[PDB]
Structures are given as C-alpha cells and as structure tokens.
Amino acid sequence: KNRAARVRVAKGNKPVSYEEAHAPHYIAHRKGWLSLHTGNLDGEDHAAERTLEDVFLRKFMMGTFPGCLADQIVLKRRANQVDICALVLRQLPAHKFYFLVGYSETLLSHFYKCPVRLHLQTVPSKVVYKYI
Amino acid sequence: LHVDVPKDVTRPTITTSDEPDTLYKRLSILVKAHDRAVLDSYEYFAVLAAKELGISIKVHEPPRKIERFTLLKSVHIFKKHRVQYEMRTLYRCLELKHLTGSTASVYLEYIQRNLPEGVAMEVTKTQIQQLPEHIKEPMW
Amino acid sequence: NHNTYFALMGNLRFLGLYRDEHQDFKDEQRRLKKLRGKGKPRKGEGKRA
Amino acid sequence: NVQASRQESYTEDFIKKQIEEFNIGKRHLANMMGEDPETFAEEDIDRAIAYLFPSGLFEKRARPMMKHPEHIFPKQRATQWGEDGRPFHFLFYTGKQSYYSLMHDVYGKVMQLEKHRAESRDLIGSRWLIKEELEEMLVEKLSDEDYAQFIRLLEKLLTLPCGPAEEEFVQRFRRSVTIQSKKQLIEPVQYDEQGMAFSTSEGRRKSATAQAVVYEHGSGKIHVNGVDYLIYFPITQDREQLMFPFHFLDRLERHDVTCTVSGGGRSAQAGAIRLAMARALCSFVTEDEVEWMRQAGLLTPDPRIRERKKPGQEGARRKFTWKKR
Amino acid sequence: TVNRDPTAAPYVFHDDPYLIPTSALESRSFLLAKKSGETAAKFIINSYPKYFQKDIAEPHIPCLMPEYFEPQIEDVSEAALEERIRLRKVRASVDMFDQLLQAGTTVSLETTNSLLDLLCYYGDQEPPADYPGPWKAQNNAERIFALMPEKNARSYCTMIRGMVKHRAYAQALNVYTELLNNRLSADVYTFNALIEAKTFILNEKFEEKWNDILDLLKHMVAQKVKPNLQTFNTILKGLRKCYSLGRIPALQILREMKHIGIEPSLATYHHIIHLFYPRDLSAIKMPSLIIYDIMNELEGRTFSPQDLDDGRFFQLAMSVCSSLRDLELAYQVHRLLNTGDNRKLVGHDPLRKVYYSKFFSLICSLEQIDVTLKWYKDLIPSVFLPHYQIFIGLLQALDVANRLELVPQIWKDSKEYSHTFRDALREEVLMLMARDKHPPELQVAFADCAADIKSTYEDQSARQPAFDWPANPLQYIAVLFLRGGRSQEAWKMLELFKKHKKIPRNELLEEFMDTAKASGSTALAIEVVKLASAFSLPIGESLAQRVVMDFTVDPEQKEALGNLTEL
Amino acid sequence: SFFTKLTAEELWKGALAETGAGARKGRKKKKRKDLNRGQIIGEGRSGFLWPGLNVPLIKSGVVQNIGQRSKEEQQKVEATMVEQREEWDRKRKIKVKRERGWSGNTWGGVSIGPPDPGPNGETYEDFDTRILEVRNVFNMTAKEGRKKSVRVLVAVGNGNGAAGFAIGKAADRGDAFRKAKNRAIHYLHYIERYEGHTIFHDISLRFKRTQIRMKKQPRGYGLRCHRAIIT
Amino acid sequence: PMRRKALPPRTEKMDTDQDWPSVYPTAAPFKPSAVPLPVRMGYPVKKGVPMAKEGNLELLKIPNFLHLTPVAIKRHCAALKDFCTEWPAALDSDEKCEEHFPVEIDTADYVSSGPSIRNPKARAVTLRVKLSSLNLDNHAKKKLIKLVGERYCKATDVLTITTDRCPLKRQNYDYAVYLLTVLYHESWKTEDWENSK
Amino acid sequence: YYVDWRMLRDLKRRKMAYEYADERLRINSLRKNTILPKDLQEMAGDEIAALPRDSCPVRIRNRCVMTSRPRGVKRRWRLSRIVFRHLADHGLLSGVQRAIW
RNA sequence: UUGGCGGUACUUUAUAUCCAUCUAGAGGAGCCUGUUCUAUAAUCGAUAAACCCCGCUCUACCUCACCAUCUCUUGCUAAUUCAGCCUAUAUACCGCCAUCUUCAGCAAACCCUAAAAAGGUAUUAAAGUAAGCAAAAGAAUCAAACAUAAAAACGUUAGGUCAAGGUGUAGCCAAUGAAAUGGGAAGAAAUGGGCUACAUUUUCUUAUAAAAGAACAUUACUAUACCCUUUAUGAAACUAAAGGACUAAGGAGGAUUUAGU
Ligand SMILES: [K+]
Ligand SMILES: [K+]
Ligand SMILES: [Mg+2]
Ligand SMILES: [Mg+2]
Ligand SMILES: [Mg+2]
Ligand SMILES: [Mg+2]
Ligand SMILES: [Mg+2]
Ligand SMILES: [Mg+2]
Ligand SMILES: [Mg+2]
Ligand SMILES: [Mg+2]
Ligand SMILES: [Mg+2]
Ligand SMILES: [Mg+2]
Ligand SMILES: [Mg+2]
Ligand SMILES: [Mg+2]
Ligand SMILES: [Mg+2]
Ligand SMILES: [Mg+2]
Ligand SMILES: [Mg+2]
Ligand SMILES: [Mg+2]
C-alpha cells in the first residue's frame, strides 16, 4: 500500500483541507504547485539552490508564526523578487502581525540578498474541504 | 476617483541622442513554462502590447518537452517497485520584426517586468549593421 | 552552510523571535530524564575510571 | 457518534442571493475586460476568467469558474409535504413517488388500449433512454431492476394499437441515436500550374508519416522522396503494400503518385504511404468504391504502436524470471 | 497611468480586512509596529553579522549587507583619527586626538577641522541611537579649537554654526568678531546662522534689531558672498514674531529674492502667510487678500524639496481658507497639491490629517450635498481615517439638504472607523432621524437604524458593570420604534426608564398614548399611567383621565386604574 | 542540523507509538503534551523585550525601544513559568466523584443520565437510565480473529409508573450506552402501582428458566429484592 | 479584551464602473477582499460545489493577470509610445536590408528567477554575412571559402562566425568582427605557395 | 552543525580541492603531454603526489545536502531519492509531477 | 453461535492461466553478478511466495559503517556538568513500502428479531435503510476510441527498513566518541539470475541491411576467461576500452521449471 502524502481515512471526524485531501498523483491534475520558480524548466540552472531556499523559507515561517498558519505557504519568485503568500489564522492581535511582517521581511532580505515581501490573507478558521 | 483627479501628472524625461539607433531585423522571444494556460495568457498580453506599440509579431508553439526519470519507491530493498516523475516544458515563441533599439528596449522591459512566476524568457536579438569600413575597401 | 542555519535559528530561538518545536520537545525529554537520574555524566567522571 | 458536516442544503433565499452576487459579478468582470455589460455573455465570462486566472490543471472541473448559480448548485428537491404535514403526492409513502407515478400512467394507458381493441416502427435509429437519463427525468434514483421493469412496460405499450397520444408519450423516452457517419471524408481536387488534377492526403503508420500527391492521369510512376519505388523499396513486400490500393480498384498504370515519407523503418514507411495513397485516391473513385476500400482495410489508420516498457519488467509485457524456490 | 484607489487603505497597511487600520490611533500604532519589527531585524543583522555575510546576489546589492560602525584601525595615527571622524564617533575621536597631541604627531588642519565639524554639529554628545544639550563652556570642541596651532576660515565658521545650533547665540556672535579681526571670510552657511542668532535673541528695540540683521547682509556683499534660499527663509521665519510691523519688510524680501535670482519656495510663502494671516487674529472683519495673489502666482507650478518648511505650506494654506470661508480658494490650493508631485509636500503625520480634515469640513459646510458625497467617498478611507467630529459635520450637511435617507448609511460607515461606541455620534444619528415625521418607508428604515444603535448601548451595558443609558437616546430610540412598526419593542423600552431612573418626557408619554388609542388596548394605555405615577409627573393624572374617555374600562380595569390614579 | 528537525505533530506521532502492531497486541503509558501551551510569541530565554510583540509598543506616551531584562528579572520570569506549568499539571491529577453501582468496579446499577432528545425537541429529562449488565462478547472473524463487542442492558424509568429496557451492542462502550439508552425509550411499559407504592397483588411467574415470586407489602416495608429488581 | 473583528470586504464598496487598473496597479497575489468576483476553484465533492474565493489556496497558487487587463494594457502602451522610435520606411523588405546592412549579429538574453542575473550562455555572439555582399575577386572567394571550412554554406552562401571564447559579450562581438576583417584581407592577399595548387 | 561527521569530512575535501585547483592544474599539465623531457615529467609526477591527499578532487562524494546519504542522490537537486520524493509528493517542487503515460 | 478447517459432496471457476495448446528460454559448456558455504585480523541489512545485478541509477583511495596500528579529550554550534554515538530493541514507532490486489469490500448512524453469541436476501420481491471511503467516473500517454500506465479502502504477514532522516526506552562519555595511515584476503564448493556460444535461417568483407564475393569440421563455428601490448580517467590502474596472439570447452542440453494474448 502507498503511504506517501496520503491523509488516511478515520471515522469521518478528521477535517482535511483541499491540499491534504489529494494524494500525490493529483499534482498537476486537481491541485497545483506550492512553489513557482523557473529552476526546473528545461535548460535552466540553480534548481538545487531554489529548492534549498524553499525548505528553509517554510521552516522559518512556521516558527515565526507559530500556530497561526491555516495552510501551507505559497512561494512565488519573479526576477530576483521573492513573494510569500500565507493563509494565517486570526489568533494574534493585528499590531503583532505588522511587527512579524516587518521583521520577517527585513531578516530574509538580508539573508538571501533579494527583495522579499510577505502577503498575508487572514482566515477566521481553517477551511475544511471534506471530513474523512 | 470621482471628483479628485490628478491635474498634470509627471512623465519621465526621454531625451533623443545624436547616436544612431540599433536596427533589429528580428527579435525572437522564447518563453517557457510548466503551464500551458499561463503561456496563453502571456501570449495575449504580449501580442496586444506589440500591436498597441506598432510592432509586427507572429506566434507559434514549439513542440513541448517532457523529461522523465525513475526512482526507487521504497526506502530499503523492493527493487522492482519504482516511482516515476516527469517535468513538462511548454514553449511559446513571439517573433518580432523590424524593430529599432529604442522600441525593443521599452517593449522588452514592459513584457519582462510582467513575466509571470514560473516563466523563463530567452530573447534572441538579431541586429543588422553595415560592413566594417576597413572591409569595405580591399587594402594590401 | 549548515552552521549558519543551525546557529542563526538557535540565536533567534533565544531571542524569542523563533520557535523550535523540535528543540522544545527535546528540552523536556532531557528535563524529565535528569529527574529520573539518567542524565549525562560529567566529563572525566564516567562509569569507567 | 456522527460528527461530520451536514449537507448544506441551499434554500431559495440562498440561491437568490447567489444570483444577485453573480449578476453584480458580471458587471464588474465586464468593466475589467472593457466590454459592454448588457451584451456580456456566459461565453465571454469563461474566456475572461481563463485569461485573468490562468490554470493548467488537466481536470477542468478543478479550474477557476464564475458560472451562474443554477449551473453549479444542484437543483434542490422541493419539500414534499406542506405545513400541516400532508404529502403533496398520493404515492409519497411508496418511497419512489415519481417512478411509481410514471409506472401508474403507463399501466393505465396499456389497459385502455387492451380494452378498446399497423407497423410499430414509427421511429427508427433510436434507443431507449439509459438509466442515468431516466433518473434525471424523475429527479430520483432508480435501481437496475426498476429500469428493466419500466422498459418492459413501455415495450408492451408499443406492441398494442397506439393513437398519436401514445406515440408522443413513448417518444419522450426514446433518444435519437447520433449514429456517427462511418464514411470517408473525400478530399478536394486541386489543380497544378500545368492544369492537371491532383489530390493530397497524409498517412501515419507507427512513427512514420507520409504525404502522397496522387494525380488523376498517369502511367503508374510512383516516386518516394524524389526516388523511384523500386530503388527506394528494394524489398518486394514493401512494394506489394504500395500495390494494394491500386490493384484493388483495378487502377494500375492510370495514376502518377509523388510521396514524401519521413520516419520509421522500411515496413512502417510502406504502410504509411499505402494509407496516404488510399485516402488521396478517394477523390478519383466512385462512392461505392470508397466504401469498398474502407471495408477492405485500406482507409483505416493502424492504431498498433510500440508499447512503453514497464519499470520492474524486462519489456512492455515480458517479466523478469521468477527466481527458483 | 494609475490613480489612487478610493476604496483601499494606504499602501503601507496590509491589504486584509483583519489588518486594515480602523482608527487613526491604530494607523500610527500599526506603522510603529512595522518600524519596530524592521529595527528588530536590523539589530540581529548588525549583531550577528557572520550569519548574514554570504553574498549570492549578482549584481551585488550593498544595502543588504551588515553594517559596521566601530573603528577597525587600532594604531594611533592621524589616519585612525580620520576613520573615527568618518564613523562620527565623538568621544573616541577626542581620545585619539588628545593622544595624538600627547605624542605630538602632526595633524592636518583639514583633519582637525573634520573633528570640529563632528563635535560642533553634535555638540560634544554621542550621536543619538537606539539599542538594548546646551553648549558647555568647558567642552572638547572649544578646548580643541584653542589647541589648534593654525586656524583657517572654516575652523571659525564651524564653531559659529555649532554654537547657534546648540543655542549658544551670545558666544557664537563673539566668535564671529574674532573671524573679522583675523581678516578671514565667512561662507553663506555661517551668515545664515548669524542671522538666526540675532532674531532668536530678544532685542529691546525692533528698529535696532532689524538694522543689525541688515548689517550682516551688508557684510555678505562686502565679502563677495551671495545669499541662498535659506538666508531669506531664515529672515522671514524670524519676522513672524512681529506680525504687525513685519508686513512691509516681508514683502520687500520676496521682491529682492526674485531680482537676485533665488526662486521662492513653498516654505518662503509659508512664512509670508503666517505673517499676514495670524491664527490669533481679532481683526477678522477685513482680512488681507494676499493669499489669493499667492495662489495665482503658484497656479500650475511644480515644487521640489528645497527647504525644511516646505511641508508646512499646504497645511497653513487650507487653515486660512477655512477661516475666510472661501471654498473656491480651497479648490485652488488642493488643485496645486495635485499638480506634478506636489502631493509629497502635504506634510507629515501631524499635518497631513489637519489639512484634509480642514479641507473636508469646509466642503461639507459650503458644498452641495451631491458633490460633498463625491469628496466623501474619495478622501475616506484612502486618504485619511476621520475622527468622529467629521461625521457630525457630514450628518449635519445631510440634514441641511433634506436628505436624511442617507443618515443610516453614514452610521454604517462610522462603525468601521471605530465610532461604534461613540456617545456623541450615536446621539446625533438618533436625534436627526427622530426630529420630524417621515413617510412609512423612511420611518421603517430609521427604525432598523435605531435598533442597531440600541444594540451598541445594550452590549456596552452588559460588558460594563456600571452603565448609564443617557436620557435623550432613550427617548429617540423609543419614538423611532413606535413610528416604524416596532411598537412591541417600545413597550419593553418603557420599563428601561424606571430601571435607569430616567424621567420620561411629556411628549414621549403622550405619543405612547396616541398609539394605544389606535391599537385599542386599554391594558397598554394603563401601562403608560404606571410609569407616570412612578416619577410623580403632573400630566400622569390627566393622562389617566384621557384613558378613561379613550377606551371602555372594565370593572377590574377601573379598580386597577383607580389605584394608579391614586398613586 | 537545522534541516533534520521535524514538527511537533510528527515527533509525538512516533514517540506515542499509538499506530502500529502494538495497538492490536494490547500495548502507565506516555501522555502527549502541548509545548506551545504557555509560550508567548516574542519571549525568549535571553529575555529581550520587543516593542509591539511581547511588550507595549508605547508606554506612558513614550515610543519604546528594544531592551533586555536583567539576569535577576529573567530568573523570576523563568521560575514563574515553571510554577504555571505545575498548576496546569496538577489539574490533570485531580480525580473527582462518581457513584458506584452494586459494586465499585462494576457498571451494574450506575446512572448514565436521561435518553437523548427526540425528533421534535422531545426532552426526556424526567427519565433516568440505569445499567443492568455490561458484557464483552466475542465473535471470531478471519480478518481479526477474536473481535470484541460491548453488550449493554439498560433500563429507563420516570419513577412514576413508566419504564422500559433495551440492549445496545457496539465495539465501544460509550456507543453501546447510547444505543441501549435511546432504544429503551421506545419500549416503555406502564406498570400499575397500588396507591403508588406497591404492586396490586402477589405475582409468581417463570420466564424461561428464571423464577420470580413477588409479594405485595404494606407501606414502610421497603424494597427487599434482587439488586437488579431494586434498580 | 475581546478578539478583534474583521471589517467587511472592501469589494462591497466597489462600483461596477470603477477604475480597475487603479485597484490592481501592479502584479499582486489574489486578494479575495479586493477582487469583486464570485470566482470558485477546486474539484467539487459529491453533492458539493467548487470552493469559494475566501481561504482558497488554489486561487492563491495561480499567477493571476488581474493587473494586466485589456484596459490597463492599452493605457500602459499609450504612455510607452513616447519611448519607441520609428523603423526606417525604406527597409520595407528583408532583401532590402541585406543590400544596405549585410551583416547579421545574433545576441541572446536570458531571463530567469533567482538572486543571480548571470547566465553562461549570454556571452556567445554569432556573425552571419553573405559572401555575395562582400567584394571578393574570383581568387579571393575561393581562398575565403577554403579557410573558413564548414563555416561557409554553399547552398545559402552565408559565412557563420560563432565566437564564445572571450568572457564578455562586447569582447566576443568585437572578436567576430575582427575575424571577418582578417579573413577578408587575407583572402585578397596572394602567397607564392598558392601557385602550386 | 552539519548532518554527520561524514558530511563534515566531505566539506573539507571540497574546500581543500578549491585551494589546490590551480596548483594541481599547472603541475599536472606538465605531465599530460609528450613535448617536455621525461626527466621533468618524472619529477612533476612526484610534486603532484606530494600535495595533500584531500587536495585530490576524486575523493569528493556527492551526498544529499539534507541527509548526507552517499548514494541515491539526484545531482540536479542534491537530494537523495527519499528526500526528493517527500518534497515532490507534497507539491513543493516547482514543476515536478508524477509520470503517467 | 461465529470463524477456521475437511484425503466431504454439488454447481461455477482462473484467460499467458490449475491442466491442455503455442513460441523463445532456464536446467549442460564458457564466463559476468548475487547468495550460501568454506574462510579472513576485517562490516551491516534482505535471505519461502513477498531474498538472491536486493538497499547500490554502483566499493582502486574516498565512499566506509569493518579489521590492524598511532594519535586527540569541551571534542562542527549562539549558549548548555555539554558535544558526539552506523550502540541494543523494526517485538515501542514515525517515515516510506512489500504481499494478498485491480481482490471488493470497509467503517459510521439507524431500523427489525416470542432475544440478539449473532443475523438481516428473494424484483411476478418476503426487513432493511440512507451518507462516507474504495471500485467506478474523471484525468495522463497532447483528435478519436481501445490499450497501457496510474489508482486500489479496512485488514493479513509483531512482513521490510533504528544503517535515508527523526524518535520512545536502555547503554558508552579518556570511549561504544573524533581523526590519520595501511588493509578488508581467497575457493578441485553448492546455488539463483544474466551474458555469449554451440553455427548453414551460419562465419568474414563491401554494403547498408537489399545484393554480391569468399569461408564452411578440427579448431571451420567458437573465449566480455588467462596472458601480452596500446589508449582513456585518476595523484595512484588494482578499472574500462581497443588490438594481439593463445586458444580450451561446447555439437542445442535429465527430471524439472520461467515468460509471453
Ligand atoms: K512501520
Ligand atoms: K571511535
Ligand atoms: Mg523482448
Ligand atoms: Mg473498590
Ligand atoms: Mg547523526
Ligand atoms: Mg566518486
Ligand atoms: Mg504459464
Ligand atoms: Mg576503502
Ligand atoms: Mg580509510
Ligand atoms: Mg562507530
Ligand atoms: Mg514490523
Ligand atoms: Mg501488485
Ligand atoms: Mg482519458
Ligand atoms: Mg480507478
Ligand atoms: Mg519481525
Ligand atoms: Mg530483519
Ligand atoms: Mg542483407
Ligand atoms: Mg596515465
């Protein structure tokens, strides 16, 4: 049996998001890609360096916004600009988000030497695609 | 804005030099992406932009490339059981013609600055110039 | 540079601007293990003399 | 111990608000695309959404959509009883009020025809509606046994003398079979600078592709890639494959063909030319002959192509030796 | 090509409903939290630089590398002193300069001047910074100035400027006297500081004081030193003290500015306006007309930052327009703000909200309601989040145009700007709605608004242990419920007058009775009598007699009504 | 390495070892703990103070700047959090009242509350439910071998003449309680009481192999019956 | 201290005749609170509709073109017209260009996403000239064709010089022009050993 | 901290090969020809041998950057098959999908 | 009563499948490679179906975890009586899979039974019902279909993997940790898989696979072994390729067994 990235069935009480519900074979069919860069296109270089930055950028955002992430973040690279689009729960006060945005942007712009912007869409609570 | 509108918006300064301008006979723009729909939207934006600036454009779709590789599915043994992965590359070629160097810089900036994420460009400018003055006359 | 990532994130965790669920998990397993008397011996004072 | 989200049944006020938001959506989408709101249509909407939200997902159900609420929201079956609680339909307690209400009518029709007392093929090339189509008409779910019984009752109605009312009734449950035109698409007949008539058609066998250019009048001179056919095809079986189209129609030595085949091997290239010549020669033969070709295999593309190899297998079907035990 | 989005918050603020600043306090707090987070990152980057040193950006981006401000040259040489001066460290540079003197090693006069510049400009104090000032007679700056073996014009000039900056006007003037005795020549910057000194000093006689400042100008021509914009701006800024007597001098300066070829900037007019249109002006009967001429002069021109008071001009111009009650002039001033990139000189946080608040308030007062609502949608929220008094002005304008149908809508807008629990605003909304009668449809709409304003009072009461329902809102909310098909709710609200011990008004009491007669419910009519007895209102007895004639009272009702009549 | 660190959900999943062959083999035990329970965003061991994150951004009208707590002040905060941890831990320790039935370790005679509301908000608050037997029956299956179900017999009554019983079976005891409890409300007999305190006459009967001999008694006699009959 | 309440989406205040280019001036992510469209995305569950825009990760994962609308592109290109220069009308055909400008210089630019703008392929330059355009005697043309080897194509009569050896594109470009000049002048020169062919 | 002591040894081998690249190029060039006297070539054969062993670039092994796995690595991403599949099967690699055909 | 089993009958069965039918193989020779065995100072894991060119899309040094010898003791990190551990337990687990399997079920909420351990179907219908997962549908192999891939629930085998990484418990901390140098050998052995040959439908040469000229049984066919030279990679040839001769066995393979619609 295949165990890869499959949220298995319980007794109908496990909420799962759209991203979690779909197994790997639905990638490019029902669900898209969380990161969009040009490094895996044919005749393009620096796939390894873009992929390592993604791993870190995801671990950074989880720790910097602990318990405030409704879904996995979406990374969008255009030219040298990096754009982070994160669904965040409305747990923290509003002013705290302004602090963490200023901090996380400046810190990641001086770490990778690129302009990095954070885009936050706040949800009242996690969106449930289906109960499995 | 309903009642409050800018009066005399400031526009950049464009100064005509005395150097002659480059003459591009052709300018091929090969965009690449994993998504066909993004290329269709970019093709519409780029063709509309060219037609609005007076540039002559043609578009075709070079054949797509699919790169596949195989990996071992299990962490240990079970050799016969594999998992395969592929990366798909799609192309849209925008062939422009008879462009001066000023028209090709403004156009390329405008379309490159609006290049979607996951899209790679490969501009192939083809300049036309006279013969070298030494070559023009045979000298022994 | 694995040293830069491990050091930088550790410094941020001590400043309160980053949270390491893995490290907090390990910090409590050490705290509990020391109470049980299975903690790390001091160097030069190991079981074998 | 059931704790999952219940069906979010859509009330009429809900769908009514979903139609006001959609109507305001169209006016905005029109203003974005610079079009006139009055004439903006469903077709323009689908095109606009595809430009503004490019998605390359293979399944089109998973792509962005701004459709009318009627298309997306399933028709809610209306309440079957009123405020007092009395069901609206006398067969409510059967559990299949619409299936049995229909079977009640058809059984009553049969009785009047049988009591009251020509060719029955008033409609031809038609089929009985499939179970899925019937379910939609009744707005309820049926079993296979329920479908089988409904058809038997409808057949009995046709057997009996049928007035025009019955013919209209049974018509509702007969779907016009869109029998496809399994006939050749004859090519046009162009004219050369010399003025000679000629037709062209493509052919594909395995990985080979050919483009023949048969001429109406000729002496049988076939040139493949600017070479003769005896030279290009040194094997007899390959030449016989080029002979099959003309020999069949007794048209040997009456046409001059010019072929251009690229790709594949010797046998795959002869086969591709055979199909290309058969399709080009259609314009110069009678329709009865074209059917004679189609029914002899000359006009069908061969779908047999090399099968991909499988991971963990020596070949497409060949397996690795099951090791001795 | 693109213009401001009227329905969006400023671009600085995050584009999320949860993160959009509701009030003006949150607007500044939200930005300070952003600036605070930027400072937290820059601190970490500058304190752990080894982790932020790998450079992977081609071309190289200098501004994204760690900063280093501490000297890295250890040897004690004139060069090492130069580094500290370049880094702007004041105390460390003094120590190494003294050490250089202790050894006696030669120090260049130009290098010695770079030290005085740092000390004179910062006034002997380390540069202000954030991390985890009068002139002192005995200080490093003056001591180093004396130790200097060879002095040049620049050296004296640096002292004169630093003294004036740090409020050492008397000493600075003395230093200038020495420069003249040495026969050296000052620069424009030094002459501007000297003029700034004479003005700040309080001279008994203005005529002497003015003749002195002019003497500095005459020495600027003897020494072949040409004035700059700041020189004239400084003189006019000083003249704002003497409003009455500075008018003729002020105009002469502006005429001289053009002849010399210096172009008056927005700051230069900011001073002429202050001098001609005093804020504390008792003589409002016949104000000056100069503001009209200035705007004509500046019509269509584009301005750039050329002084430190340019931002002040726009805020002051609108204030004078509001004082003069001329809305045509306010459009000219705003029209000038829109030409080119003049928008950048509106002002900072204190003055940006004053200009637009002054502007919008003038529009509502003197503009047609139709146009006033166009300005309302454009400016708010995109430009500024207004305070509650702005809404009171908008609501009053709607009342004067006989367009109270929009009062419910203005209330919904106010709730987004953190006026949901504002007592002054809630009283104005209810008052205007219930001031006069209206058609049935309008009354029903007002009743829904009255219910919404009631919920604010109710929720506030529940949360707070001690809450008072103001008397006037209670009357307005009750009247609106009766008039708008919510009479049942109004009978429940009748009890709240006793719970909060508020005296019902005579008009409200009789209104309840009128509705009762149409309903025909004697019970409801007697309920009004009960409340009248509680507060011992004299009309209550008359109202009870009115019920006797209006409705047929049952014998049980007669006994109950008689008891209340006795009470 | 920073790249070999896993999330809390994945760390507890493995450490708890709930999923696995152990569960089917019947295998105190470790307890999951939330480590972000008391942690405040912006609070670190070093004790830095970050305006707008863990301290007021403006204090008494003064725009705050970055700072750090002294070694003494931080030690207090660290010890205070340690105390707050003990308080939360103590809560779980507390064990509170329940009522035993016929015996301390048995479910027989235990009140489990009223049946659930009906279709149209028909509450049954006046009815009480009592357990009469809880059994762990077993059905042999090829997939699972021995599979266990909980068979519960309950009785319900309003103490005013109406009572009923039912059997509920499930794999989980809590489910078997709900099934029996709501099933029994559908089988309500009405029992005739002489003057509301006793049966109308002596009753002797045999049901299958069980014999019962009831006798009518005067007031104050009390219930002198099988513990189940008392229930 | 109650939790903060989110404001209603600003799409509610957007008129149907608004200036949308101002709403999305530049490339931005999809904001359900700023896009006044009831768009839905997601494979629907059985007896379910596609998911709504709010909290929709799939719509966020899309590179939208909301900033690029037909109204914006036309307003943008109107401003960008002042930059453009007019192609000389006389050069109305490709053959006309070969007459007056026989030399074709091919240079390639590459645009990718990342911190580095450096691509190794950008240095290469390619010069293409037709020998007919060059003034070559019968002797010269034979000498030019033998020296260049496979660079010359008899079918097209085009000489192709590809230079990538130098680090920069301006160096490789100047080198290809140099290679042509030496080949041209050497072709005309006649060496005594040539008489032994 | 790097993943393990094996990745640490590999990292040092990569930094000592970069230091000795020009040197090992210049010396090794003297040996890879037939134009110089064999006496010089025999001596250059020992100068290259005398350099430290970790300067040799054939002692470098490509390991997964995240797990330090010596075999199973894909050179375009520098990840093992196990790590690659985890990122690919979760939609985190841009453009990588399963191959169905 | 339920399951399981039956050298218990009955009916229907497998679809490259249990037998039969068809084609090329395996089992014999020569080698290549795995494993066991023997054996070495010298890894580990897999080892019936579901191990045996398996983890390895890969071991001359490195890799490396092994053996021998010498050496280091706060010993990668911002801090830490701490760092580090390929140390034991896959019978504590996560992760990622195998097998049944392209099998058709699984589990939740109910309802019914002269009591229920459990069971619940009949279509000319007799107590079963209505949602979820799987199958199906859809998508992919760029028209169409078919086909192939992919997908395949709950469980079964305490199946595989503490050595991808992580981790519970126990253990080492001047050593079970870190580093350097040199080694990690072989077989009158058995066995699994592959490769090549045994030739005439063949061998060599030109060609292009068409045709032609020669060879054709003692070395004719026939060595990817051994040995001898040269080249490529590397610091190191112990590796790989290309020639050279030397050439031995083999003459289509016993029972038996593999794959293919
Ligand atoms: K496992
Ligand atoms: K060791
Ligand atoms: Mg085969
Ligand atoms: Mg007890
Ligand atoms: Mg390790
Ligand atoms: Mg290697
Ligand atoms: Mg078989
Ligand atoms: Mg080794
Ligand atoms: Mg070694
Ligand atoms: Mg070890
Ligand atoms: Mg196991
Ligand atoms: Mg299988
Ligand atoms: Mg399909
Ligand atoms: Mg399927
Ligand atoms: Mg086991
Ligand atoms: Mg094992
Ligand atoms: Mg042949
Ligand atoms: Mg060599």
Swiss-Prot record, chain B:
GO biological process, one term: mitochondrial translation
GO terms for cellular component: mitochondrial inner membrane; mitochondrial small ribosomal subunit; mitochondrion
SUPFAM superfamilies: Ribosomal protein S10
Assigned keywords, A-Z: Mitochondrion, Ribonucleoprotein, Ribosomal protein
UniProt keyword Ribosomal protein present: yes
Annotated GO MF terms: structural constituent of ribosome
Highest taxon of source: Eukaryota
Location in the cell: Mitochondrion
PANTHER family, per database record: MITOCHONDRIAL 28S RIBOSOMAL PROTEIN S10 (PTHR13334), SMALL RIBOSOMAL SUBUNIT PROTEIN US10M (PTHR13334:SF4)
Family per similarity comment: Belongs to the universal ribosomal protein uS10 family.
Subunit structure: Component of the mitochondrial ribosome small subunit (28S) which comprises a 12S rRNA and about 30 distinct proteins.
Name of the featured protein: Small ribosomal subunit protein uS10m
Curated annotation (Swiss-Prot), chain D:
Subunit structure: Component of the mitochondrial ribosome small subunit (28S) which comprises a 12S rRNA and about 30 distinct proteins.
Molecular function in Gene Ontology: structural constituent of ribosome
Species lineage: Eukaryota, Metazoa, Chordata, Craniata, Vertebrata
Family of the protein in this entry: Belongs to the universal ribosomal protein uS9 family.
Species of provenance: Mus musculus
Protein name as annotated: Small ribosomal subunit protein uS9m
Keywords of the record: Mitochondrion, Ribonucleoprotein, Ribosomal protein, Transit peptide
Region (Disordered): 303-325
One GO location term (cellular component): mitochondrial inner membrane
Any single GO BP term: mitochondrial translation
Keyword Repeat: no
Domain of life: Eukaryota
Cell location: Mitochondrion
Part of the full-length chain shown: 60 to 390 of 390
Curated annotation (Swiss-Prot), chain E:
InterPro entries, sorted: Pentatricopeptide_rpt, PTCD3, Rib_mS39_PPR, TPR-like_helical_dom_sf
Cross-referenced Gene3D superfamilies: Tetratricopeptide repeat domain
Gene Ontology cellular-component terms listed: cytosol; mitochondrial inner membrane; mitochondrial small ribosomal subunit; mitochondrion; nucleoplasm; plasma membrane
One GO MF term: ribosomal small subunit binding
First and last residues of every PPR repeat: 73-107, 108-132, 152-186, 187-227, 228-264, 265-305, 310-344, 352-386, 387-421, 470-504
Main function: Mitochondrial RNA-binding protein that has a role in mitochondrial translation.
Recorded family membership: Belongs to the mitochondrion-specific ribosomal protein mS39 family.
Identification of the protein by name: Small ribosomal subunit protein mS39
Protein's organism: Mus musculus (Mouse)
Gene: Ptcd3
From Swiss-Prot, chain H:
The protein's name in its UniProt record: Small ribosomal subunit protein uS14m
Family, similarity comment: Belongs to the universal ribosomal protein uS14 family.
Assembly behavior: Component of the mitochondrial ribosome small subunit (28S) which comprises a 12S rRNA and about 30 distinct proteins. Interacts with LIAT1.
Assigned keywords, A-Z: Mitochondrion, Ribonucleoprotein, Ribosomal protein
Main location: mitochondrion
Organism: Mus musculus
A single GO molecular function term of this UniProt record: structural constituent of ribosome
Protein localization: Mitochondrion
One GO BP annotation of this record: mitochondrial translation
GO cellular component terms, semicolon-separated: mitochondrial inner membrane; mitochondrial small ribosomal subunit; mitochondrion; nuclear membrane
